[PDB]
Amino acid sequence: NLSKNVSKHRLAPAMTAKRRNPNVITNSLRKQLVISSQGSVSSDNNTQVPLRGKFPANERHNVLQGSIECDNEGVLRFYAGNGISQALSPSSLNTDFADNSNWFDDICDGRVTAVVELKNG
């Protein structure tokens, strides 16, 4: 994927990078900057389950990160969010291509597990 010439001949040096939302200090309080959610579905019941979190994590907005469904045959279906991005104040504009403080979006990623329970036991 990547030739060793780039590093060795310094063709595009990696830059340092500061924190986003840098005014929130200590790791304990920066946990508020993380939106997270979880859910479970099974083949017995196809009711859809929303993966809803909060920002800042527990003012405060509900963030629909996704929705999960399971059907009669055991296939999980994962719907992403509605594409809602917002800032904690309307006057905070997202003028940078990548690093805008006070903002959140409903993008997510995470871990998919399962348990198989057979008739006999």
Among 2, 5, 75, 111, binds a second copy (CB under 8 A): 111
Using CB under 8 A as the binding rule, whether residue 91 contacts a second copy is answered as yes
53, burial (CB in 10 Å: exposed 0-12, middle 13-18, buried 19+):
buried
The tokens for 14 are 């990696």
Q: Which amino acid is at 82?
A: N
Closest of 113, 54, 49, 42 to residue 88, by C-alpha: 54
From candidates 75, 89, 114, 116, binder to a second copy by CB under 8 A:
89
Q: Give least dist CB 80 to a second copy, A.
A: 11
| Residue 29 structure tokens | 């309080």
Q: Does 58 bind a second copy (CB under 8 A)?
A: no
Beta bridge partners of 85: 105
62 touching a second copy, by CB under 8 A = no
Beta carbon of residue 26, minimum distance to a second copy (angstroms, whole number): 5
Q: Could you tell me the smallest distance in angstroms from the CB atom of residue 82 to a second copy?
A: 13
Q: Could you tell me the sign of the dihedral formed by the alpha carbons of 40, 42, 44, 48, in that order? A: positive
* Identified binder of a second copy from the candidate list 41, 54, 61, 94, rule CB under 8 A: 94
Contacting residues toward a second copy, per CB under 8 A: 10-34, 36, 38, 56, 85-105, 107-111
